Structure 1
């Protein structure tokens, strides 16, 4: 089942700035214009996040990039993917990522979200490729090379089936998917957010409060994660199982959290519209000292 991916151009790692992002709802408490101050794990403003490209330029030039390394998991990670089509379809969480321990698998196989906690044998390059045929011409999802076996399953969750728009559109990015993972007391907290955007340069700048999505009681330890991407297998790109691939219009950003002090602001309905990082500059220090945005 495990198939490698050769013919890939290497490049130095790129870094961008997350201006004001990663702010989520710390607790399920309704607040109407109270300007609450919380002490929890958040993403620092104007931080230094990593940029992973996935492009493919025609001809014997350009870059053939398909990056999905095993990144560390230090107190939680911030996952933001500027997607043009359905390419990022899940992640892999765990410590050993082998049959020695357990691992969390939250993947989308073009049917729905599949959440399983078993002892898998994850490959060195897992992916869920698509297939574009000429007869019955429709982008279909016939590929599954994430793991080899699954024994001693503890937790499982598969919701109702659903279709998937595997259309490989060409142009600019259309939507943004932000995710904040955290595991502090056995419960795996996930904060998701959806925001349309049409930029093709970097991470969008603004503010969006991520809402809690699922609270999965797993109890397993998480020290290093990995992102699962997709591949395109069609004509004009011949090759073997480990070649003849193509991709593009895919990128995801990873930011690590740390204990900080934030002054969240709620509106008259309960949504977070603005926040300040107290440990950024003396201006925000004074703002958090007097607990107001008017200085």
Structure 2
């Protein structure tokens, strides 16, 4: 299935405060009004290509989507990133020990790391040897789909994993709905308000008005 991304998927491009300014930026971003591929947790987690990078989200009140995998083979023929949330921690690995090859969770650690009524959002991208993750959590009353309204994602972590990534997958937990949208190299214009929160954005390659 498909649905419209609207204006969602913008994130803070750098760790610098600014306020009352229209700062321009060029980066991998989710193109405005692009189609997101859409999925249901019940009765749906294939492997997808990763491309330039991946926006991801889930609409929730049950916490069934709980992780991600990124790599080229995703099966320990070669090393691949694993991410899990376990309701006390965020946990990250590249270890060689074999994964759940038909992935769901039952309710050489050469890199290892540890830290509907909601929409949870992410942006995942790989540049020059560093993987990067951004996020947002927000309440929703619109149980139906991604809101036609604006909020911006903020960086969680930078991960110097050095691994080649060209495919990804998502992990579900059992004894909800989730989305995928590919990023592209885009110029964007951002508005930072008087408090230095991004209240609006423009995708400079959307349409002649945005150009």
Contact conserved, 2:41 with 2:65, CA < 8 A, in 1?
no
Higher relative contact order (CA 8 A, sep 6+): 2
1:155 maps to: 111
What is the number of residues matched between the two proteins?
210
**Quick check: 120-129 or 276-285, which moved more?**
120-129
Structure showing greater Rg: 1
SS of residue in 1 equivalent to 2:210 = helix
Distance in structure 1 (CA, Å) of the matches to 2:27 and 2:69 = 25
Report the 3-state secondary structure (helix = DSSP H, G, I; strand = E; otherwise coil) of the residue aligned with 1:121: coil
Q: Does 1:252 align with 2:178?
A: yes
Instruction: Report deviation, 1:256.
Output: 0.2
Provide, for residues 167-197 of structure 1, a one-character-per-residue CA deviation record: whole Å limited to 9, x for no partner: xxxxxx0111101001112111110101101
- The question of whether the paired residues in 2 share the 8 Å contact of 1:181 and 1:191 is answered with yes
Quick check: 1:205 aligned with 2:148?
A: yes
Q: What is the Cα deviation at residue 51 of structure 1?
A: 0.5
Shift of 1:158: 2.6
The CA distance in 1 between the partners of 2:166 and 2:38, in whole Å, is 20
In angstroms, what is the RMSD of aligned CA positions?
Answer: 1.4
Cα offsets for 1:65-122 (capped at 9, x unmatched): xx11101101110011001211111111111112321111111233321111122433
Quick one: distance in 1 between partners of 2:206 and 2:114? Answer: 42
SS in 1 for 2:209: helix
User: Which consecutive unaligned segments of at least 5 residues does structure 1 have?
Assistant: 1-13, 57-66, 130-151, 160-172, 233-249, 286-295
SS in 2 for 1:228: strand
- CA distance in structure 1 between the aligned counterparts of 2:153 and 2:197, rounded to whole angstroms: 10
